[PDB]
Design a protein around this ligand. Structure first.
Ligand SMILES: Nc1ncnc2c1ncn2[C@@H]1O[C@H](COP(=O)(O)OP(=O)(O)OP(=O)(O)O)[C@@H](O)[C@H]1O
Ligand SMILES: Nc1ncnc2c1ncn2[C@@H]1O[C@H](COP(=O)(O)OP(=O)(O)O)[C@@H](O)[C@H]1O
Ligand SMILES: Nc1ncnc2c1ncn2[C@@H]1O[C@H](COP(=O)(O)OP(=O)(O)O)[C@@H](O)[C@H]1O
Lengths: 23, 507, 217, 517
């Protein structure tokens, strides 16, 4: 007689990122 | 490489850095029976946190250096690969999978590695919770072909929540049920750990200190489990010896008094049970010795294995049950009033026993697992049982026969240690152990002196005047009492006459 | 020098290029109190964006120039730290290491520098971190052992996200609560700023317009 | 290397460059017990920020140089691990310190940062002391089971107000020497008292240090163009929280001079608030447990507003929570309340619609009233015993022709539990507003209207006859503060609005209503 509400989270999305070289 | 995420249990076994396990060598044989399979040779140690599952593979690692293994398990090196350590320090895309492939590269290279992934429920949900590549989808090809021997270890709940729900993963792992030990099994565990303790703590441990560590931890600790909480008591026992050497049973009763909080440690206190119940109840002393009488049988003598610890009808009433709970294991707050006058209908019968799933009240009610059997002993008071529907205490016919309640969430809550007390059919009344009768001016004025001394003891400590008169105690007896009712909560008459005029002392 | 990797905020105060803050004297002296401490000698100025966190230390720069300052930090040059110019042109290896060591030895060389790092959360977690240590881990030992006192200014949200992340920062930074002005304090601010806006727009601004602009905003 | 890890807290302890740790010696004893185990060694030291977790280990560092330690910890150094002081090469030379010295005991401040380096010290090879918060333990450290088999929770709580005083007496000479002023006993005994009352975002064993550090710092400032006491540290708090120094530095019944009418109920509640500011009753029991039964709209919600004024300094920071939304634990898990009472060390919480609740919650409802303790999910006892309890509750033939005071008290026992009124300090039943009490409420609500018209340069005085009509249109014997404000809109404001747009009134003058009935 009563709903449950799954309530989907959002994720942080483990990221690629460019970096910077220096010579 | 593989040393960066866990220690070598086999190399720790031949250096004697592992605690010996006594018993659970049928569990070790079952794990060797899985590990010597071909295709899915991956056991998962099913238990609950502290029964000894690291200790199973600690004993398997000792069995390899002893050569007590099959030829498919000799010269195997066990590594406790912590997969949470693989997640740790992994902020980037692909950073996680790199140090798991470095682990699996040494599996292919060595070929004699058995991973012990403690907390195997973490394997689902290490990269993306099966939405993408996690650590499960990396291992699932090699686990299914026997090219990666992996001993998991997880709680039976976590095996059902994470490993069983992934039906692809549950076939890769073979459930080895590591049960919680018995108390007599825990004592012989601690016999072999006596050598490990006496070398470290500089103590000597007597024989019954183990008995008073295993029986006593089963009796008062229910969050923790047997072959860990009893090791904890001998650990904390030497932690009183580091304050100071032979430990007693009182040495363990000291360190459980630290842990749980109760200092009470039954035949002596059961005989003079009445006096520790007189300290909160004066007047109506016939019912005090009556509820002392039947409990001197149940907790001293003969008892059915399926019965609550006494069952009573009360017809102060609830003030005696609060003092009864204080003697019961040492806490005031074990008394749970259900307020049976707050239920009259049949659909409200599921509002105190748990809802059928789908429905209203799936958690308002059905929390009795975390209430009753969470505590080692309890007193459940059913206040105003006459106002209830018949259908509600048809469900209480379970717990008067057996002492088992089926929650609406499907849990079996044992009432076998709970003093079930009703307060106001011939089938309902004969299962109750006793009918205890409370009788309704000299008894009221002695409860006046009992209740003003609790207040006045604090009052003069903060430098306040104490002006009392024994004639005024009879004036408290007139208002704070009702023949037609019951001693109108005298405490309300004390805060009427004393505490309102407590403000009129600084004025 | 710090003039290339920042700007002198008290030289901007004696050239009259900082806006005066009429009021705010309790929070400027607050910064001077928690500079003179011994365990949390670093004022970080927390507050919602717009309440005038930068204006406190610009009001501190005017307090030093006017001589309204104790003579433990009299003639004590405030330099805000431009992290843009500190990172810019660090194309070669170890430049950003060397630049941030130069601006910290120039503080210890002269000792008439008290450093302001605007957006102190930007310091934490950025600046060189691929093959060298970043900006924050250079500041961190001189903030922990004590060779260096920053004045900081984060948002109240950004203070919990970056500075209140590690405890070894928390025992050295004192959060200075720069609150919203009330409407009556804002009218005092606006009447004190009136000369800067009567001169820029060459308009006149009535007292009604000040009490309107604080009440209606 | 060895000193790029951090600081030897024990070389600093014998040198005297470490502060004295006075008080909290039982928690230092609990740490050195757990350090003396073999199965569950290496205690993680749990406490909210500023309660002393470095200080317990800084007390343990002084314990090893005094011989207040067993033969286990005797002559055993303790380094701290500064991670901010090539990175991954040196952090695995941390685990080399077993083979290097063998005296190594590590203190890791913020141990939760090590799990998601993460020295696993071959299971248990490097002794360790952690430091974490109650919730940061149960979210990072307690979540990972490999970390939980070894590290032991050691609960370090916030000091009580009187225990903090003895901490500050021991830390007196270090602030006496740094700020070169002689800080007095007054400033100490009023530090923790005034820091607990007016700060809750940080804890006493720090926030009390923060004001005596800063009051001493203000001395060294204002000498440049030598005693600190109760007034000097109250000057410092006013410069922080803003709370007027005077405030920081009984009941006066003044409450009635803000609200309208109900004069005896003002003096009724002022006698029990005067009692609990002396603390004469049991501090286990709540400070003020009041039920504001009786008529609604007679200014009984406003009495809590003035009581929030009288006991905050601020007019309104009082907690408003609603009940009656409950048939699940999913909805009743808000008993919103646990986080806003956490921010307020004192609040005035108001419980409306408490005649409507789910029947199981009445068991847990008594824990608000009897105990004043509700341990939330972060493992923290939320106070309600240093917080006043306000229970706002609103309760044929030819017979015709007004004391219902005890008659209210009869159905109080019936609609609620008969032991719910056992823990009520006094009962309040209000009166219906009479013809002279309702007419000065009309002055209160039109004072908002005249304030809006003062801004466009006019003031209007209403005659006493004009307010007589509004006071009887805006009163019925079920309400009376609620319909009055609507009738001033529908009779005064909607007429005055179109009269200043059509400019019948226009700009500056006085208008006066002279009504004919
Ligand atoms: N007390 C004050 N007296 C005069 N002007 C002030 C005062 N407080 C703020 N201001 C002015 O109001 C504006 C606030 O900008 P400011 O950068 O000082 O605020 P902030 O809170 O530090 O902002 P941000 O979060 O973006 O750094 C500026 O124009 C500033 O000069
Ligand atoms: N059969 C056993 N013999 C000896 N020690 C045991 C046994 N079972 C558990 N232990 C003890 O348990 C601890 C190891 O943790 P364990 O019980 O294996 O945790 P879990 O069950 O969560 O894997 C050690 O103190 C170990 O000595
Ligand atoms: N019992 C105590 N005796 C002396 N100083 C203390 C005590 N408890 C806390 N302090 C001081 O209060 C502050 C608390 O900070 P810290 O020791 O890092 O603890 P936490 O880790 O809880 O923030 C420090 O200045 C510390 O020296």
């Amino acid at each position: 007689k009563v709903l449950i509400l799954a309530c989907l989270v959002a994720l942080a999305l483990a990221r690629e990122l460019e970096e910077l070289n220096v010579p | 490489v593989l040393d960066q995420f866990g220690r070598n249990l086999t190399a720790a076994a031949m250096e004697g850095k592992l605690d010996p396990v006594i018993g659970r060598e049928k569990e070790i044989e079952r794990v060797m029976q899985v590990l010597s399979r071909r295709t899915k040779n991956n056991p998962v140690l099913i238990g609950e946190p502290g029964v000894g599952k690291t200790a199973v593979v600690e004993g398997l690692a000792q069995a390899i250096v002893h050569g007590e293994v099959p030829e498919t398990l000799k010269d195997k090196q066990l590594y406790t690969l912590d997969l949470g350590s693989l997640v740790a320090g992994s902020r980037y895309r692909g950073d996680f999978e790199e140090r798991l492939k470095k682990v699996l590269k040494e599996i292919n290279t060595r070929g004699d590695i058995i991973l012990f992934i403690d907390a195997l429920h973490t394997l689902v949900g290490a990269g993306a919770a099966e939405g993408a590549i996690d650590a499960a989808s990396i291992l699932k090809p090699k686990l299914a072909r026997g090219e990666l021997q992996t001993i998991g270890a997880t709680t039976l709940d976590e095996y059902r929540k994470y490993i069983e729900k992934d039906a692809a993963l549950e076939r890769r792992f073979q459930p080895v049920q590591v049960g919680e030990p018995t108390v007599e099994h825990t004592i012989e565990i601690l016999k072999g750990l006596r050598d490990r303790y006496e070398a470290h703590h500089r103590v000597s441990i007597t024989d019954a200190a183990m008995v008073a560590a295993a029986t006593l931890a089963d009796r008062y600790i229910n969050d923790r489990f047997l072959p860990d909480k009893a090791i904890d008591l001998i650990d904390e026992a030497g932690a009183r010896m580091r304050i100071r050497a032979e430990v007693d049973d009182e040495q363990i009763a000291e360190v459980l008094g630290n842990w749980t909080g109760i200092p009470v440690f039954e035949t002596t206190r059961l005989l003079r049970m009445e006096e520790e119940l007189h300290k909160r109840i004066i007047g109506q002393e016939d019912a005090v010795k009556a509820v002392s009488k039947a409990i001197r049988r149940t907790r001293a003598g003969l008892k059915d294995p399926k019965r609550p610890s006494g069952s009573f009808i009360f017809a102060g009433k609830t003030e005696l049950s609060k003092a009864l709970a204080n003697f019961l294991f040492g806490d005031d707050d074990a008394l749970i009033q259900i307020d049976m006058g707050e239920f009259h209908d049949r659909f409200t019968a599921s509002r105190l026993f748990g809802a059928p799933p789908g429905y209203v009240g799936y958690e308002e009610g059905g929390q009795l697992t975390e209430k009753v059997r969470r505590k080692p002993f309890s007193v459940v008071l059913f206040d105003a049982i006459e106002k209830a529907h018949q259908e509600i205490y048809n469900s209480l016919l379970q717990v008067l026969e057996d002492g088992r309640l089926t929650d609406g969430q499907g849990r079996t809550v044992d009432f076998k240690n709970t003093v079930l007390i009703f307060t106001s059919r011939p089938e309902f009344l004969n299962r109750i152990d006793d009918i205890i009768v409370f009788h309704q001016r000299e008894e009221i004025i002695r409860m006046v002196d009992l209740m003003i001394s609790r207040v006045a003891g604090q009052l003069k400590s903060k430098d306040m005047a104490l002006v009392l008169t024994d004639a005024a105690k009879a004036l408290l007896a007139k208002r704070g009492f009702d023949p037609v009712l019951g001693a109108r909560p005298l405490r309300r008459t004390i805060q009427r006459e004393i505490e309102d005029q407590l403000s009129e002392k600084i004025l | 020098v710090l003039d290339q990797f920042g700007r002198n905020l008290t030289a901007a105060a004696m050239e009259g290029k900082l806006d005066p803050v009429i009021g705010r004297e309790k929070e400027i002296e607050r910064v001077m109190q928690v500079l003179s401490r011994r365990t949390k000698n670093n004022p970080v100025l927390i507050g919602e964006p717009g309440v005038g966190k930068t204006a406190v230390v610009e009001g501190l720069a005017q307090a030093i120039v006017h001589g309204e300052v104790p003579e433990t930090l009299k003639d004590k040059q405030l330099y805000t730290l431009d992290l843009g110019s500190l990172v810019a042109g660090s194309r070669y290896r170890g430049d950003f290491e060397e630049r941030l060591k130069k601006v910290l030895k120039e503080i210890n060389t002269r000792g008439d520098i008290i450093l302001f790092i605007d957006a102190l959360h930007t310091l934490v977690g950025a600046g060189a971190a691929e093959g060298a240590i970043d900006a924050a881990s250079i500041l961190k030992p001189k903030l922990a052992r004590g060779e260096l006192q920053t004045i900081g200014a984060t948002t109240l949200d950004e203070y919990r996200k970056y500075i209140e992340k590690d405890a070894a920062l928390e025992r050295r930074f004192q959060p200075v609560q720069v609150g919203e002005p009330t409407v009556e304090h804002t009218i005092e601010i606006l009447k004190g700023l009136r000369d800067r806006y009567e001169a820029h727009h060459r308009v006149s601004i009535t007292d009604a317009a000040m009490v309107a602009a604080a009440t209606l905003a």
